[PDB]
Amino acid sequence: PEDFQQHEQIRRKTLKEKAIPKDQRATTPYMTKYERARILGTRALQISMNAPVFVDLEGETDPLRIAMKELAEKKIPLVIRRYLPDGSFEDWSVEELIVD
Amino acid sequence: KMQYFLSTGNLVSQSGLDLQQVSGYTVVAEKINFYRFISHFRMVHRGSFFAQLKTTT
Amino acid sequence: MDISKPVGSEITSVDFGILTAKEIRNLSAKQITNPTVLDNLGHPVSGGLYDLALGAFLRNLCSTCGLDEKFCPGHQGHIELPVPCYNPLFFNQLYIYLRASCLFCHHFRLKSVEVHRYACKLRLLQYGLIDESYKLDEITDISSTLLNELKSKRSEYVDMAIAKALSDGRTTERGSFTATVNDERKKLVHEFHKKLLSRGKCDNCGMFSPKFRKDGFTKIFETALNEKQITNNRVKGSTYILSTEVKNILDTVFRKEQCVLQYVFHSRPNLSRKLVKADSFFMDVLVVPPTRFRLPSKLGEEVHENSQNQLLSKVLTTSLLIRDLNDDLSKLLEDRRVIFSRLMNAFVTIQNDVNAFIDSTKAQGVPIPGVKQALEKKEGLFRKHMMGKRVNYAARSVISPDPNIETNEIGVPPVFAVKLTYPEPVTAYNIAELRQAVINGPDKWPGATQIQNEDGSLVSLIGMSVEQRKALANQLLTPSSNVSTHTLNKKVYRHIKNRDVVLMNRQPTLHKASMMGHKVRVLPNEKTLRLHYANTGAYNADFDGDEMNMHFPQNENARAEALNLANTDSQYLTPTSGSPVRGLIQDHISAGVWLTSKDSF
Amino acid sequence: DRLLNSSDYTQASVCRECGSILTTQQSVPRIGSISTVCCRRCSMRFEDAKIDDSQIWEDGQGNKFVGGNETTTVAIPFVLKYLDSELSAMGIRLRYNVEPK
Amino acid sequence: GVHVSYDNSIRDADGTLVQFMYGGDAIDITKESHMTQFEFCLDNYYALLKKYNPSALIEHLDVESALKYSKKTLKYRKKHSKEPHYKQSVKYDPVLAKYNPAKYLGSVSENFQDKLESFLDKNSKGVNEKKFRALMQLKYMRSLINPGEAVGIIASQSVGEPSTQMTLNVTLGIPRLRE
Amino acid sequence: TATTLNTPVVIHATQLPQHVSTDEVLQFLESFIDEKENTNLSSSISQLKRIQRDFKGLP
Amino acid sequence: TTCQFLTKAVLDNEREQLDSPSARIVVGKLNNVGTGSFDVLAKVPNA
Amino acid sequence: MYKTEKVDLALNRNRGDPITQHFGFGNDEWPKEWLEKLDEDGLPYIGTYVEEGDPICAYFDDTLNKTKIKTYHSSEPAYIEEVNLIGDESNKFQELQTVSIKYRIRRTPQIGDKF
Amino acid sequence: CIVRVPIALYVSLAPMYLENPLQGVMKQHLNPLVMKYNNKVGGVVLGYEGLKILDADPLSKEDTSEKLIKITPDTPFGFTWCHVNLYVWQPQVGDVLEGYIFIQSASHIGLLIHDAFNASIKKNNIPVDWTFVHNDVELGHWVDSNGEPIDGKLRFTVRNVHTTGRVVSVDGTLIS
RNA sequence: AGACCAGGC
DNA sequence: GGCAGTACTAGTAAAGAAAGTACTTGAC
DNA sequence: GTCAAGTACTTACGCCTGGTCATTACTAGTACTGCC
Ligand SMILES: Nc1nc2c(ncn2[C@@H]2O[C@H](COP(=O)(O)CP(=O)(O)OP(=O)(O)O)[C@@H](O)[C@H]2O)c(=O)[nH]1
Ligand SMILES: [Mg+2]
Ligand SMILES: [Zn+2]
Ligand SMILES: [Zn+2]
Ligand SMILES: [Zn+2]
């Protein structure tokens, strides 16, 4: 209770130190070939486990084709957490990243 | 003790003979082809000492 | 792996540690004691290597958790060795500390101000303070007045340097351990151990100790102190030493010099504040593995027990030999000699058993492989069973060439379009083509071979009839009759269709473009893979009987990477030079010499 | 998917405060009770530790004793469980500190 | 363990650093094939402009800052550098290890900077001069290696696979690589 | 039963428990019943109204 | 020499952070190189 | 392709303990489904078509009062060409325990075969 | 003896509640938790109050609606920390509990506490100086030292609390 | 599960 | 009719033609 | 203290398929039989 609270407030404060602010992020604005292959991948696992779909289904039954369609109109609600070698990170949403 | 030699190829001798290797002295004659079968009776092997050896000459 | 049975806990680190004899008297299920494995009519004997407390065995419930073979994970157990014995993994590091220490004051034979100089350089190396540890040397017959003053300033120089860098954002109290401070730590300890073993006299009390001798393993000797240097022993006003004797020496050494060995055996700082003890290098208690991991190799009726039992049987035979030898100590001058010379012989052989169990090369004796040799090489455990594994959901067949394939595809046989299968959970869009895939059955392509229910129930389809098979097609998209499984859905293991993704691969997998990802077009006739000619320049494959693997991935994180990331279209240029590897090879080039000629009309 | 998910995937119960794969094991429940997963190393014999009606559990031996219920599932390879079994026999102790504590 | 980080600085798995930038220029081998082939890309200018699409890719970038400092040093190095390497009091970083090459349009290496402007001065040729050097730099920036590439696997397979093309008075060949 | 989709993975305590009176119990039950109907936990809900009508009514 | 780097690791009480790809396959972690060099964070609309 | 395996009913015992397993059918309730592949002696017919799951030979066991059948453990369908009866070299004349059987398999040249 | 507990839990979230992250935690981890005993809390959970999801980024204020959940690499389910105030009912020894009669058995007074919670008073906890008349027609009533039939309420102490089985029960003694 | 033998690329 | 010799039996005990660094020992 | 001569120790391409073989001596015991 009092011992767990110090174990939590140290955990949430160091993880606040790792958060680079949204203006001071200096990595690339281009979504890499590795980030695209997981934004399509992890969203495709969600659609097959009955996630709400934000795109109109034109008779496509492959869930990966749905995620490929959702990336074209920027309708994927995922955020890339680009870790740094020190342990710090940057949070880029998919609609911010530009493809290819 | 001879049928064990032919069935296995291992050379169990308390005074190990004047040759280097100790295994692989018998090979199953195939009769999978007559070209294969006549080839077992003309083949000459140097030894199993020389197979596990990284030389070329 | 099931993608609907998630896990929430992650192993973040590991840290190696000595498993002391106190825990494995508490960890254990039952201490096992007789050197017999099983009696007449196949029963596991109690108190033996096969015991019902150590896990289930051969259609017989466990006596620790009470489960059968399918669910009991196997349980630990220990034996009691009556003598302490050497752990052969740590014997060479023990023989450094077995030597290099005075047998009289129980310090090391250096001066205690120079041993302290390594007790404070290593403390700086635990934290990220590699550079401050060289400044520490720059602090400079001889009385103990200024030696105590020198140890005071060095201890205050370290304590000033730690709290400065720990406050100036540089090093957490967990330490900062990188590669180049592992360079200087291993450079310092190998200088510390080189200088400990180079000593004539103890520089805290100036007299000698006899030299020791390592004959090999299973034995330890100390030689004869000569007649010239026993004079220095008298002015302070060959022999087989045992294993209780050596342990009693190092119990005193690690207490007089506790301040130094805390930094030799720790690379990050010891936050748990445990004490490094001499019992660490010894092992008073062996640990038998769980009996799941030493089940006997059944070959019809040719049943041989697993040979770790055969090594542990010899440990228990000598351990019940040496106790009855100690019964004759309770009986008792001529009989004193013969029963003690064979007792001292039994001191060697119980070490020679615990060596042979641990390492088959550290025991004199065709030999039985110990527990070290089930880890080391190719045909080990890391290389043979961790770095590379046998895999499910994969095929391998001879390849035949095929044009009229769209250069990013592989052509699968019907004998591979039936066995291989993919978990598709059903949704509001699958129930058209996956109701029809489950009506067709395991033999009709496109079909399905199993249905996984929400509850983990795995319903097969092989033995079913077609009228019973349509009844399970309508029960497919139904809500849950359980509150606990309302968020799941049924997985239909469908056959591999024309849209699936496949990783083809050919040995030797030299460069990364010898293992690509293809689409599939399912072919109807024969039992061979159909590869296009543009792919064969990058697999380095000819059609004189090459066979090559076909790995079929099992979730949507892996279909999305053999289509986008290990895609064969993206493997056009090899990254060696930047030169392409894909292109038409032999006949399609000699056609272009005739087609783009001036004669072709 | 090759080296872990479709070769030897297993979900094994792991103790949070031990960090040990092959220590925790099933408790033998009473009639009408549910069985729970419980750790051997961070336990204590009930004759030693003199209780709150739920930390007490029992073997199939009949040795009933209180214990640490600080355990949870971790998806590991199964050969990791065989790695610790041939490494505890050496007297080495691997410690698996899981992240959510 | 070694791989590209998000700092455009390739390094090992524990965090220790091997190179500050991949090859000194951080561009992928499988994309730098047609990069110095300028007269190829000049003849296919209107077709390459349909895939690199300049006006759609200015808005997430900074064009102004990196092109300045690429002229502050090129003016310095062309005026100087008659003298050898130990004499050069440099006064300037190379322009590629100061700004981010995957975000700042114009941060190029000092051979792609020279061989562009040399080709753009050896001849003179409707596409003008300013629309061309603003497209090679868009091509160069898009030819950057991605953060996360397995470099040391590719670097161990670029030696290990051509090593098996020697089989299958100085010492020579595969017994040299052992030494 | 008793999976990670039914149970929390890790569960602890933020602060030490402090006692409440009948007012904090009955202000809860005029809100916890309010925010539930206005979903197969109705066997627990019927056992809540036997505590809500304990401090107000009679069985 | 797997049990010579095993003795040198346990006599340091060495705590390895599971960073190398060879250490994440022994314990079954996702590999740090490439697709597993980052996490994926699903935005949820409500609070 | 001619393949041959040896059915040996005496792989378990040693030195004069009695013959617990006999060829042929006993008097339990064994199903009539394997008269098509088996003769009255518990042995197959010469020329029958055998795929996986079909019985190779039947035998009656005395310690169970049950006719167990051995089955064809191969996924490639075959025809039975010949069935031997192998006696033993012994002074005491014994009921047979060893039957050798030869299969033939049509290897019509499929694609992928090396010429 | 109702007490209030603030807790910190680590729960999973399903893709079907990626449009409603609040009630997805409710219908999985909180609604199957009410009216059950819980070891890590202390007693029987009566309910919850004020669920708050700890957002993963430490830069967004707690007023914001668009929070974000870390996704497991293998499975598409998201794990998160949350805060909620449970109201839990824990009986402890020494305290006195009102006991309302539910079953009149000859060996036990097996009653209800607050019309929901079962309790037990064994016959040996009942002192010897009280009697019980038989019931031949159709389980009658215990006769105390007052000589009156018992009915309904009783304030008695706590001897033990048995929680291992299906529902909770409170063992009560009659010495004080 | 090994030891050997015969292979295939 | 029963005694002792062998022949077996099943029973439980022993099994010499590759290359690099690290290392203690050892003359001095 | 420094430098040796000799030791002891570890490595040695990937994948795939078939076949065969597998503890021995002996030692004490129960039983078989020849015998008087
Ligand atoms: N790593 C290994 N690869 C092998 C081995 N044996 C064969 N191979 C592979 O199989 C192929 C065999 O090629 P060959 O020995 O027949 C030389 P050949 O001139 O006949 O090739 P073609 O001109 O294609 O006929 C070659 O590409 C090798 O990469 C081996 O022992 N190890
Ligand atoms: Mg070939
Ligand atoms: Zn068990
Ligand atoms: Zn001393
Ligand atoms: Zn524990």
Side-chain angles (χ1 to χ4, degrees), chain G:
Chain G
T1 68
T2 67
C3 291
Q4 293 183 0
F5 292 115
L6 196 152
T7 66
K8 291 179 182 179
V10 69
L11 290 175
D12 294 337
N13 293 320
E14 186 174 2
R15 182 176 174 181
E16 46 186 349
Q17 298 301 113
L18 299 172
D19 291 329
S20 178
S22 179
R24 303 178 76 91
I25 295 171
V26 174
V27 77
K29 295 294 287 184
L30 187 64
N31 194 2
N32 287 320
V33 175
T35 307
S37 69
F38 61 98
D39 289 335
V40 173
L41 265 283
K43 285 173 71 68
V44 292
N46 290 319

Side-chain angles (χ1 to χ4, degrees), chain C residues 159-175:
Chain C
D159 291 331
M160 182 63 74
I162 299 301
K164 181 177 174 65
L166 197 148
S167 178
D168 197 75
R170 185 175 295 118
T171 302
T172 318
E173 68 270 16
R174 295 179 185 271

Side-chain angles (χ1 to χ4, degrees), chain H residues 7-112:
Chain H
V7 176
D8 196 1
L9 267 287
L11 59 91
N12 56 4
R13 62 180 177 87
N14 193 3
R15 183 61 70 188
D17 49 355
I19 43 173
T20 60
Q21 289 176 351
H22 301 285
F23 286 105
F25 297 102
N27 294 115
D28 55 346
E29 187 178 1
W30 54 275
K32 302 293 182 181
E33 190 179 2
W34 54 72
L35 277 310
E36 296 176 354
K37 305 294 187 291
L38 290 174
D39 199 0
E40 296 180 355
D41 54 357
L43 295 174
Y45 291 106
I46 301 302
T48 186
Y49 177 71
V50 174
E51 67 270 19
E52 187 182 4
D54 291 333
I56 170 179
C57 68
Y59 65 97
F60 181 73
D61 194 359
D62 289 332
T63 60
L64 278 77
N65 292 114
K66 184 180 176 183
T67 64
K68 292 183 181 180
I69 54 98
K70 294 182 184 293
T71 187
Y72 180 71
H73 291 283
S74 178
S75 177
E76 192 169 4
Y79 296 94
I80 292 174
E81 191 189 7
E82 67 183 4
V83 171
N84 290 317
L85 301 189
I86 298 169
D88 197 2
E89 288 180 353
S90 64
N91 53 4
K92 294 181 180 180
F93 296 101
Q94 190 178 2
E95 189 178 4
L96 74 160
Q97 297 296 111
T98 302
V99 166
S100 178
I101 188 169
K102 183 183 285 187
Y103 291 97
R104 69 178 186 268
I105 294 94
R106 300 180 67 187
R107 293 296 179 93
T108 298
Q110 302 296 107
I111 76 168

